[PDB]
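Hi W., the menaquinone-9 complex you wanted:
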Amino acid sequence: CSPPGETASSEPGTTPAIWTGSPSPAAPSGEDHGGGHGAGAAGAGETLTAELKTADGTSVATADFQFADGFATVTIETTTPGRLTPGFHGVHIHSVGKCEANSVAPTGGAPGDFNSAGGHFQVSGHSGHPASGDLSSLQVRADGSGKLVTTTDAFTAEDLLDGAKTAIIIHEKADNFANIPPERYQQVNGAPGPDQTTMATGDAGSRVACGVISAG
Amino acid sequence: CSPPGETASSEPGTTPAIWTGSPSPAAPSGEDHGGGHGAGAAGAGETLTAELKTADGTSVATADFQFADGFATVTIETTTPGRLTPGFHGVHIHSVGKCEANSVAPTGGAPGDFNSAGGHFQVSGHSGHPASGDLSSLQVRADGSGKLVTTTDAFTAEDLLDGAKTAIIIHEKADNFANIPPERYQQVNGAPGPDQTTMATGDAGSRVACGVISAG
Amino acid sequence: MLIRIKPADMHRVIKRKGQESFNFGELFAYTKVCSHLGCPSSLYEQQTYRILCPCHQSQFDALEFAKPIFGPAARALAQLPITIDEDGYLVANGDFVEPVGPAFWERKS
Amino acid sequence: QSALLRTGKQLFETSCVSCHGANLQGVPDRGPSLIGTGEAAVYFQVSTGRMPAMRGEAQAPSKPPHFDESQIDALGAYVQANGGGPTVPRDDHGAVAQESLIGGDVARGGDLFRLNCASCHNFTGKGGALSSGKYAPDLGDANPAQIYTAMLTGPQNMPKFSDRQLTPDEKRDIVAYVRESAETPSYGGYGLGGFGPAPEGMAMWIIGMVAAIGVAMWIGSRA
Amino acid sequence: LLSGTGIRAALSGITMGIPVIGTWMHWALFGGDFPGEILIPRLYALHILLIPGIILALIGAHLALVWFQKHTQFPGPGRTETNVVGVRVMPVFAVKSGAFFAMITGVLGLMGGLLTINPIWNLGPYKPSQVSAGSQPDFYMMWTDGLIRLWPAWEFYPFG
Amino acid sequence: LLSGTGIRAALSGITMGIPVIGTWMHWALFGGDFPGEILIPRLYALHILLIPG
Ligand SMILES: CC(C)=CCC/C(C)=C/CC/C(C)=C/CC/C(C)=C/CC/C(C)=C/CC/C(C)=C/CC/C(C)=C/CC/C(C)=C/CC/C(C)=C/CC1=C(C)C(=O)c2ccccc2C1=O
Ligand SMILES: CC(C)=CCC/C(C)=C\CC/C(C)=C/CC/C(C)=C/CC/C(C)=C/CC/C(C)=C/CC/C(C)=C/CC/C(C)=C/CC/C(C)=C\CC1=C(C)C(=O)c2ccccc2C1=O
Ligand SMILES: CCCCCCCCCCCCCCCC(=O)O[C@H](COC(=O)CCCCCCC[C@@H](C)CCCCCCCCC)COP(=O)(O)O[C@H]1[C@H](O)[C@H](O)[C@H](O)[C@@H](O)[C@@H]1O
Ligand SMILES: CCCCCCCCCCCCCCCC(=O)O[C@H](COC(=O)CCCCCCC[C@@H](C)CCCCCCCCC)COP(=O)(O)O[C@H]1[C@H](O)[C@H](O)[C@H](O)[C@@H](O)[C@@H]1O
Ligand SMILES: CCCCCCCCCCCCCCCC(=O)O[C@H](COC(=O)CCCCCCC[C@@H](C)CCCCCCCCC)COP(=O)(O)O[C@H]1[C@H](O)[C@H](O)[C@H](O)[C@@H](O)[C@@H]1O
Ligand code: HEC
Ligand code: FES
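Structure:
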């Protein structure tokens, strides 16, 4: 005798498809935790990255923001060795997460990477001083790299998980906030007070980088 | 027979001293090391902390920044639930690491937590644009917490170990950096350019927090 | 076995030569291995401070250096020097000043 | 090198163009094309001597090499330039590496050998038989470079172990195990070859049993 | 490696191929699948006590039978079917048998010294994925193994 | 637990006790200190083959 089933010359066959393994069911339900966080919203977790790109479609910076033990433990690294020039790029948090090359939410001039729906994306109940929307100057030297953090937690993961995706936008200015006080300095009109546009958020020239923080 | 050695009525004894174990020479061939980093200096490693205190000795915040893969990752946790008021604060890197209540390196008024030997603690070869001497901002909401990051890498672990210990000093302003451009705004004397003191570093009122970055 | 001698009964403690400072306050660490044939002496009786061995019913007076006051045992249980390191955790402040298991020919010298 | 290439070409033209046709293309049904075989293949094969081959049979046997190290290098360089492929390892000076190929770990080398090499060769690198007139030869003659290049280029009916399949560290460990097993003295007496059951049974039947029977014939009386 | 491969071949395959009860004998010997965690302990019992005990009992029966059913002899001058011509046990037979025992154990010791047998250190630990080319049993089971090799791969496939 | 503590007492202790050769007997029997990893195989052999024989 010979084995009943052999010798199927016909039906040449097909290349196997790329395997897409299904997740382990309740049986092997064990899986790695995606990150613990307060998550006072629909849920974001302790893991969230983003890529701040330029007007040419090339990545400039790569930010990371996520709650760890009730506070966002974030970190940003320059994705290219010559993204930022020898100076301080002023970071800020824009409520609008669209990191478009150039957009204008209101009726007016559309600045480069100006998709933000205002200045600094403050909290829902906070619209005065420079809340978590505001950010200071991060410096890139002749090496051209950016990595340094601060403590800006006017918002949390719940606040980040807002109605509209937010973004991190780096313009080409430092962080002063009307360093010239009214005692000595004067404005264009002679009033010793500061400018509302400068006070609400960091105003600079054309935006250098912009990246949606919606797990970009 | 009784064993040769027994019984001791005299010499009541003493309380054992607190044990101070020694590093293993046998089990470890060398000395165990913690954080790993390039550390292009005398050696700092991938672990660097700091505690920013207040004028009365209270802990304003606790920062920590260290190099991992050529980019310094940092994070700051609020030391008190109400360290920062419901507004914005500007954090700057000061060359002098003395987080004293009030000091004046030059001949002039000694501002609170003004131990810095100038403005932003820029790199040795950089003294123009706002180099790494400027750090990210700290926006505090009604919650009063600080957690956020930027990309400020004009200096690295090698540059951190400079001749003098550096510090992070947070005043209570936003991040603008002469957001009023010369086209529209004007100075006190009529010139459209910005102020040198404002451009050098984030200038605001009395400093709120100050912490030495020499592994404080 | 780490035993906590009551503060009231701490005044009845009699200490051995070279083991006076072994105890950390009111903490005494004695080897569990019975000095006679090496069974653990786990049966600790408080309010009598007697470490009894179940294998052959030998009692060692914990208050005094753990010397046998009954049963086949004739040598005291070895006392471990103990202290607290940094963070307050209990650590041994040395090694037994005598071999700890049951006795044998090459011993007591 | 220019002169090395020229020497390799001259040796090739008067050695193998009859079966690896000029231009390194293979002669149909006499020899395979050497394009892509590389310098390692040439080194192993010619140094073991298999390649000055004077018969088409089940397997090309080993034999004394027909070329000295310099000519081996010339032929290897010529073949590498023509085709391009794996290169034999070399030490700091430039000579073919021998001691540098002895991996530090021998337990790992032995495990890898058993999983991959002993399959056909032996527990300890003695030879093995194959399907139709073929056979895995004893590895005790091979030097570390020869073992490494044998793995690097599957010579004949031998799986080709790329560097990706067996990282050079793993190949170095296997080389160390091969050399150690080959140069290690038999503990417990004369290892009768390396095969246990068959040489042991023959030695029983010939040494122990003839001794016992002869002693019995001495003690007893024929009748 | 060598002996475990031999076990995998013979004890497992042959046992598990037997038609009506093959798998049942395999699982009952191995306490389950082939690498069952009781095979070597069971073989140890069988090999140090059970089978050697039976061998000792049967050798006792054998020697007792030879002793009391007087040893047969070749035809010869004074040798008939109703007598045993030879030497008595005490003076000559006993001494020569003891001397032969001494010489046989001397041969065995000499060979244990001078000739290497079963270098298990060379033969790595058993792993199902590893194997050598030799893969032979001792010369007494070599005939069974040779039967396995030579028999011409005739397999029958009854209904399912 | 019971049989092991019984072994520890009787075998190990009384073997180490013997004056001139006690420790040597203990090490020969257990192949080392008391919990030597050959004790139970040795006892198994002694108990199923040697002493029963
Ligand atoms: C299934 C089966 C048996 C198939 C056939 C395979 C087989 C046994 C073929 C024969 C092997 C031979 C004799 C090869 C030489 C070529 C050949 C056939 C010549 C013609 C034969 C012939 C008629 C010659 C004229 C007179 C004659 C009969 C001479 C025979 C010559 C020989 C080899 C005699 C002795 C027999 C012998 C050693 C046979 C090989 C069998 C074995 C199992 C050897 C075991 C063995 C081995 C294999 C070791 O490697 C080893 C290494 C280190 C120490 C010890 C040993 C050791 O003992
Ligand atoms: C590193 C290390 C451990 C090394 C050691 C290796 C090891 C583990 C073990 C081996 C070590 C040892 C102890 C080796 C020696 C073994 C041993 C006892 C050898 C004895 C041979 C010897 C020393 C002879 C000295 C010369 C001399 C004066 C001889 C005459 C006196 C003697 C010794 C007579 C002995 C007679 C003898 C063999 C009795 C065997 C008893 C038995 C089991 C059966 C008797 C018996 C026999 C012998 C038959 O032939 C027979 C045939 C037909 C029917 C029945 C019988 C029968 O019943
Ligand atoms: C009567 C009782 C006495 C028993 C004999 C005891 C002999 C004791 C010898 C001395 C102590 C042990 C030496 C152990 C050192 C040692 O092992 O010995 C080898 C040798 O080996 C050989 O060649 C064989 C050389 C020939 C002499 C021995 C022949 C004896 C046979 C005939 C005994 C069995 C009877 C069989 C009868 C056959 C007829 C049947 C009808 C030598 O090295 P080598 O030669 O290089 O081995 C190669 C590795 O190197 C290399 O990698 C490796 O790959 C291999 O190639 C390896 O061979
Ligand atoms: C130490 C252990 C000693 C043994 C003691 C224990 C032995 C107990 C054996 C009885 C237990 C029940 C048998 C189970 C297994 C069984 O045997 O298979 C039966 C087979 O009945 C048939 O139809 C066969 C007859 C039809 C073909 C005619 C063939 C004639 C042949 C036999 C002639 C050649 C004989 C030559 C002898 C050579 C000897 C060599 C030395 C059918 O299958 P089934 O009972 O439903 O079992 C299902 C599994 O088949 C199923 O794969 C699984 O999925 C389960 O569902 C299971 O329940
Ligand atoms: C299966 C195993 C069977 C046994 C076979 C193997 C036995 C070999 C035993 C011989 C080996 C050498 C002995 C080693 C050990 C030894 O025995 O100790 C010696 C002792 O000599 C003395 O002076 C003693 C005499 C003086 C006192 C007089 C006493 C009379 C007594 C004996 C009377 C009572 C007898 C009653 C019998 C009751 C029987 C009960 C049923 C002195 O010490 P030492 O040789 O320098 O060894 C150092 C270690 O002492 C050291 O602790 C270590 O640190 C090492 O340095 C080591 O080298
Ligand atoms: C059967 C599959 C097979 C396996 C797998 C295999 N070999 Fe081989 N090996 C052979 C064959 C067949 C030859 C002979 C090639 C030739 O002569 O052209 C050979 C040749 C060799 C040689 C040349 C010896 C000489 O003196 O010429 C060495 C050394 C060697 N193998 C070692 C190894 C090493 C190292 C491995 C790594 C696992 C290995 N073998 C795996 C079959 C194999
Ligand atoms: S075993 Fe403890 S007193 Fe005897």
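The helical segments of chain D are 2-13, 38-48, 69-82, 107-117, 144-152, 168-183, 197-219.

W.
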